[PDB]
Amino acid sequence: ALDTNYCFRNLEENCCVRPLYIDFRQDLGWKWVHEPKGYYANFCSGPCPYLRSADTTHSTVLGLYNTLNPEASASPCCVPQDLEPLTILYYVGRTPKVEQLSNMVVKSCKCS
Amino acid sequence: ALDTNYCFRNLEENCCVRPLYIDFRQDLGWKWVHEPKGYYANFCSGPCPYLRSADTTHSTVLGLYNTLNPEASASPCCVPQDLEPLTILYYVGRTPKVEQLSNMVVKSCKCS
């Protein structure tokens, strides 16, 4: 499937992982989050040609229907598939808390 | 979550289920499939405003990041969530086969 390592060495217009660094404090406005200061959420973006890592069979039917009947604009989307969690530190009053939020960073995408 | 029954009584620009009837024979070109002749695959389509049935937390972060930093066009997509299978009949030579393909028709969508 298409993941970072791949989507990163080589560029693809079609569904692939795009890197994205978010900074909790700014563009998000999470001040409670005290550290790390930002992470690489990355995102999935790209058109989904017929067969490019399909999810369900419905995703295949669609991709196809769409392909040979373009008027459609029915096409399956490119979303994340695999995503690791992220750990962050914040304080409850003045006692630090280190927790790991799940699914904060994507690693692979897929046309669903 | 947004499913047919809902997305169908009321119209929504945002992520919802859209009905779609596909005909195996035509626009798909499956002749082997002998009956039914077509079904309602439906599809998911719509923008994903911040919070509209989010999938992962990453989907929330994104939706938000995206919301207050629109330049982004990062936004999470609207894909199917729940989908029932479909049964079809075809012949291996002249001996009918009734099988059920899984995930051929969507019922609910979600922003992922």
Curated annotation (Swiss-Prot), chains A, B:
Effect of C109Y: In LDS5; hypomorphic mutation; results in impaired TGF-beta signaling
Shown part of the complete sequence: 301 to 412 of 412
Protein's name in the database: Transforming growth factor beta-3
Positions of disulphide bridges: C7-C16, C15-C78, C44-C109, C48-C111
Record localization: Secreted
